[PDB]
């Protein structure tokens, strides 16, 4: 089930941001399914080698998740990062320094 990088079917990062930000603003507490979908999206960018968008998504989520400051969002972001780190190492052995 290989797709081009899409989130809820949104490939365009603009539309993705619209989704992420709406999610993080309207939803006070992320559901594991949503979190895993963000996970699968980040890893999807890795496989499709579009680290450009990946970098942008990561930083964008940082902005939103940490502006909401709550541990559920903070841990969520870190959790996603872990996936990205490990998967990048599996694939290219080259990770992105997320700070």
């Amino acid at each position: 089930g290989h797709m081009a990088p899409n989130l809820a079917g949104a490939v365009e990062f603009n539309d993705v941001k619209t989704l992420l930000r709406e999610w993080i603003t309207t939803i006070s507490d992320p559901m594991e399914e949503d979190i895993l979908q963000v996970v699968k999206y980040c890893t999807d960018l890795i496989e499709e080698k579009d680290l450009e968008k990946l970098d942008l998504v990561i930083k964008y989520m940082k902005r939103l998740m940490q502006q909401s400051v709550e541990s559920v969002w903070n841990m969520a972001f870190d959790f996603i990062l872990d996936n990205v780190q490990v998967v990048l190492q599996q694939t290219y052995g080259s990770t992105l320094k997320v700070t």
């Binding site: 809820a8 079917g9 949104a10 939803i27 559901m31 399914e33 949503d34 979908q37």
Partner: peptide, 17 residues
């Protein structure tokens, strides 16, 4: 119910494209 509690599930479902 009809849609899940997942935001993205909802979004994927509402996009009947």
């Amino acid at each position: 119910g009809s849609h899940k509690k997942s935001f993205f599930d909802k979004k994927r479902s509402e996009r009947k494209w």
